[PDB]
Amino acid sequence: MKDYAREENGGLVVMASCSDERFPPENMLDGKDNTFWVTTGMFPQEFVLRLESCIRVSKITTLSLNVRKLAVEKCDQDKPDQFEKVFEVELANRRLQTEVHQVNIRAKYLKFILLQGHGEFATVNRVSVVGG
């Protein structure tokens, strides 16, 4: 039904492993894929997404550059204590990259780990998490 990572919908990054104030986490949640969060060296890096509430998630979608391997985990607790794996995936080398994932999980938190990149640095341009 709805994309709760959106931001006008409560989306919020709480736990990013690197930041440049020019390309901050919040860029991932503005619907506009010409803006991005950038990693600033070495892998892995990761960030934690909080949804306005715990929702049944049906489809996770990431838009990126230079990411080689991507891992996602969930936590349906109110505090992000224990995360559980959802999926891990290897990305062709590309030029922006879309990774759509039909899923059936319950989550309040989503951790995205960029386990490795195709170069030194990598961006994440959009995170979309749809459910209700």
Binding site: C18, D20, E21, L65, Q116, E120, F121, T123
Partner: protein
């Protein structure tokens, strides 16, 4: 710190040092992998190991052995890279306790390595740090351009 607006991190085979880039508001942390740490070995066997593309080669002025040992390393490091496309940025460093520093400067120059004599300071770090920052600033604009 806390004027910093971005912190970059950089894996560096030496065979965590934060360096601020002048006249920027950016900080570069060099993750120094001393061979025989063994930080380097832990990383090579690691799952997701990406190879290393930055080195600081150090030698003792009075041991030609240690100098030649630095040349071997450099050629290896070059050959061991997964991604031919990214070059190996390295910096040679002389230091005390034989070696012709005139000859050493040369080799380095011939081989496009930055040279620094530390007998008898942070310049080799400042040097690797700026180099790295330059790539960041380039890639980062390519990204912005790529996605319009």
């Amino acid at each position: 710190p806390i004027d910093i607006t971005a912190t970059l991190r950089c894996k560096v085979a030496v065979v965590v040092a934060p360096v601020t880039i002048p006249d920027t508001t950016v900080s570069v942390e060099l993750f120094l992998l001393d061979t025989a740490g063994s930080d380097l070995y832990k990383e090579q066997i690691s799952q997701y190991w990406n190879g290393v593309y930055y080195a600081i080669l150090v030698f003792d002025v009075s041991s030609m052995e240690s100098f030649e040992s630095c040349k071997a390393w450099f050629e290896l490091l070059k050959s061991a890279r997964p991604d031919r496309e990214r070059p190996l940025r390295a910096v040679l460093v002389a230091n005390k306790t034989q070696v012709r520093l005139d000859m050493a400067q040369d080799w380095a120059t011939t081989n496009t390595l930055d040279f620094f004599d530390v007998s008898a300071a942070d310049a080799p770090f400042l040097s690797i740090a700026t180099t790295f920052y330059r790539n960041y600033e380039d890639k980062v604009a390519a990204f912005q351009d790529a996605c319009r």
